[PDB]
Symmetry: C3
Subunit: 400 residues, 3 copies
């Protein structure tokens, strides 16, 4: 059950949810309809579970890559923007939320990873990944490190993997070929090998996550990090004088980050579809709406032409757009769940030394494609559950 | 039941005329000295493949033809080789229903299709459309009655509504089924199931209603209509209800499309009595006298035997049965039908009970019906069930300390 | 994990590991590099688990059928022999270790099963399988038996199954069709049915394994066995006067043994790749090298042309090559593991009487052409683990 006459919206905890809530306050002030903004953990996984039961938020925010899966699973309502409203947003952002001929979400903003560097610590950032090892050695002598970024989410290491030729699904003849996966070719192998070598050579730690990497950079312990626009706000609050720039090259090739369009989908089971449309079209996707969210945590290059004309003047947004141009807009196909899970497992296993880069990537190629009932994620969850049950069994055998 | 030589053990579903079939068995025993045992175990369609795979089970198994391609593919059925003269006694289309990869793998017995069964005293003019059923129920509720009750636990009964406006199992093209093209989640399938769920949401039907409850309600004059096959008419006759058998209601102006079954008799690949089974089936069951004995117990539908069917076809209930069959389709017999049926069974039950939305339930069913295999939906369900049970046992055990 | 400046080699326990170590000793005297030969149990399964973690031997020996799987999994280095060396080996043996255009191992020897018979007990061996039951009935009256061979490994029963039409994967239109499996056709079924009838009629025991059959033949208790060239050494040391000959026919058709090419692969994670190449090319694959291995346990028909010209004069080798010519060289494709596991399970289940031949083979056809993550083997392991956990629960409930 979803309460009628109210809007519940879910958005990730790294985004400007407090700003989104202000927009909700304006909506409530004009209409009397309460808006509740929440940022639950494991959002992208939680939504498909509750939505399938007819429960969950009225509106779900995530990058566009998950939306095809949601739509295929019967979880999203088709959105019906009139022509005039569709002209307010960039066409390519609409393309990102089109699934099987139908618009399945409202595009909000374009996200791409950039290299973020400490200006005082490193006035001239490296153009290549190759020179990072020597840079780190010099900084260790000063009690610092070259680079820390999230190694637990494949999103962040993907630009290096794609740099020299790695790809997700081959786009051929108007479609993605789910039988043609590129996570195990020579370029992908070379990219991940470099990451793993950085860790082998004590220039990076395999255990480093989002939180640890952010804290190290914002406290001035590391000279560089890799992140998107949402992260700039916390860096501002800290004392670090930072620049946002083009990602380093690898083997002479640009890093190719996967570009995301933060998007707003409407729960198929919502009894407030028309309120959701009004909130999204008449309140959020306006100059005042996006500004409020942006002021909280920066959105990137927004989908709304009128407000983007302002943000484009920002050099950090230019760097963001340069990096996006060098990458590719993510597919939204249902198979993106398997791809992301496969690559997540490979990077983590290779980085920790449990699998070689080659073994890990060969397995990722297999898992990214395809099947359904017994996916890699499912087998892993089962094996974890069995281990947990075994543990309980031993503690019970002990008390017997 | 490690299949004794020199005896016949027969399995048939409990809704069928097993007592009548036993009379045929008795006649067989008097002529040949070979004892025939007819049994009707619960869940036989699932029990047969399990026990037959070990060389156990009945010599002869009765079920609608849709399960038989799977049985045959799994190596459980003997190939049937009737002489030309015998094969000519049965309609060719009924033989098509039991032909798998060029081989006959059962004897066809009878054609089954669902019809709308209505109480003439309670409802002299039955509804032509599903759409007018809510208002009909509203009138009948005021008299302490209801419009319609039928088995909502078996997707067989709900499939006619789902298929009405465009739902399908596997796409038929160029002479074969494309098992990668499943149609349980298109606009028509979704519209049909949504209508059913809306019937439940608006309290015109109850999600818990099963076969025995719907039958009792109709035969007691408590509900104006039910949906059932010919095997059901016998108990209605016995109840004395003034009933008619008629065309299913339309949905969105389109006929309901029941999946039609051909009741069939297969021979266990492991039976050491294959010749006795053949003789029983050809020279005893598939005669005018044989089928009549079964039919007198529970009606078979339109039988496969030409000579006996020319007599039955004159019955208006059989004409209605054939009209509904023509509006539906004879089921595929391909191995993938068990996955299809299980997928739809889960979807209908989950949506009717409110556990899943109609759209989520059918989208997963579309996925599950096309599951290549080794890890099927059913196996996944059984695994999850087994784990929760073990978790439950541990919770009770930790509690005891 | 893998020591640099040293070589560790793994080879199966039935092969001439002592003889290979002698080659290892010769390598060490000339180069100063220590060579360690090991024969761990369950080598074919143990290698991919340890190699995937960057551990294991530098060199792995096994028949070529598993190598495509090892290579697909990213466990094998491409070998770089160069033209002149390749000319020393038969072209068809190079074909056996070529995977997706690359050489992924060095071929060593061609192995095929033969009929091995006691000349004193049975001076004229049966030409057909059909005449074996009557032979056993005659021999049992003398306190002996006609035939015992390993019934636990599908390798040994495969020749009978393939005789009348059974096949693994159809080689059609230039490639193996993993969707066209032939273990459930009329020929496969007729072949397995005959085997099961032998057992039902007490001419054989379903539990008979490699060790039991070998001991039975070498103690003069059974008149015939089925084995490869490796087994002759132990027979020589026994008192049995034996002959090696063409396998019996079935329904007028030759038995079709699956032919293996014993091969040496190089662990992708090895830091001694150059040492391994020099070892394999300049020490093992020479006349003295192979002869040293051969004297310990016979290799069969070797891949090195110069030494085979010698071995070919041996009538036992002529028999081996006659049977090999009547069979087919195994595919090396990754799918061969599902195939072997599928068939292993079918033969055992049918032979034991737990399933009918038709049910077991029909299920094998399905398993051999599996998907990806949920293989038959995984399911079996899952079921095994559940049964154990269930047993523990009953044992705890028993304690009250
Ligand atoms: O790491 C895999 C993950 O990458 C992307 O998620 C991003 C998201 O797009 C950003 O807005 C930000 O929150 O970082 C996330 C990574 O932690 C994909 O959108 C997501 O589907 C995928 O699983
Ligand atoms: O509900 C799924 C079920 O439908 C059919 O079973 C019918 C059967 O054909 C009729 O003779 C009668 O007994 O009712 C059954 C439904 O309860 C399919 O034949 C069967 O395979 C399928 O599971
Ligand atoms: O039995 C299945 C098994 O057969 C082959 O293994 C052979 C091997 O090739 C021989 O060299 C010798 O050691 O006997 C083995 C049988 O026990 C296949 O090569 C192997 O992949 C397969 O599992």
């Amino acid at each position: 059950k979803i309460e009628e006459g109210k809007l519940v919206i879910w958005i990730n905890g790294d985004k400007g949810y407090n700003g989104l809530a202000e927009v909700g306050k304006k909506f409530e002030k004009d209409t009397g309809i309460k808006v509740t903004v929440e940022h639950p953990d494991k959002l992208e996984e939680k939504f498909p579970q509750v939505a399938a039961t007819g429960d969950g938020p009225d509106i779900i925010f995530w990058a566009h890559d998950r939306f095809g899966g949601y739509a295929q699973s019967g979880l999203l309502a088709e959105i019906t923007p009139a022509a005039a409203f569709q002209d307010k947003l960039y066409p390519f952002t609409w393309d990102a939320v089109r699934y099987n001929g139908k618009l399945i979400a409202y595009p909000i903003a374009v996200e791409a990873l950039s290299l973020i560097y400490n200006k005082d610590l490193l006035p001239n950032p490296p153009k290549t990944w190759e020179e990072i090892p020597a840079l780190d050695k010099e900084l260790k002598a000063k009690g610092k490190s070259a680079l820390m970024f999230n190694l637990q989410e494949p999103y962040f290491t993907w630009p290096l993997i794609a740099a020299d030729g790695g790809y997700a699904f081959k786009y051929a003849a108007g479609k993605y070929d789910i039988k043609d996966v590129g996570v195990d070719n020579a370029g992908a192998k070379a990219g991940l090998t470099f990451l793993v070598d950085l860790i082998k050579n004590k220039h990076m730690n395999a255990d480093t996550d989002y939180s640890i990497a952010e804290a190290a950079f914002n406290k001035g312990e590391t000279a560089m990090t890799i992140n998107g626009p949402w992260a700039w706000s916390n860096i501002d609050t800290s004392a670090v004088n930072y620049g946002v720039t083009v990602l380093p090259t690898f083997k002479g090739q640009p890093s190719k980050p996967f570009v995301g369009v933060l998007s707003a989908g409407i729960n198929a089971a919502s009894p407030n579809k028309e309120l959701a449309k009004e909130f999204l079209e008449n309140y959020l996707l306006t100059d005042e709406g996006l500004e409020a969210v942006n002021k909280d945590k920066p959105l990137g290059a927004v989908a709304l032409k009128s407000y983007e004309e302002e943000l484009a003047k920002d050099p950090r947004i230019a760097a963001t757009m340069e990096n996006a141009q060098k990458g590719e807009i993510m597919p939204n196909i249902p198979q993106m769940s398997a791809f992301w899970y496969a690559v997540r497992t490979a990077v983590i296993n290779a980085a920790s030394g449990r699998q070689t880069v080659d073994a890990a990537l060969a397995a990722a190629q297999t898992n990214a494609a395809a099947m359904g009932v017994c996916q890699e994620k499912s087998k892993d969850e089962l094996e974890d559950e069995l281990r947990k049950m075994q543990a309980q069994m031993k503690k019970l055998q002990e008390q017997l």
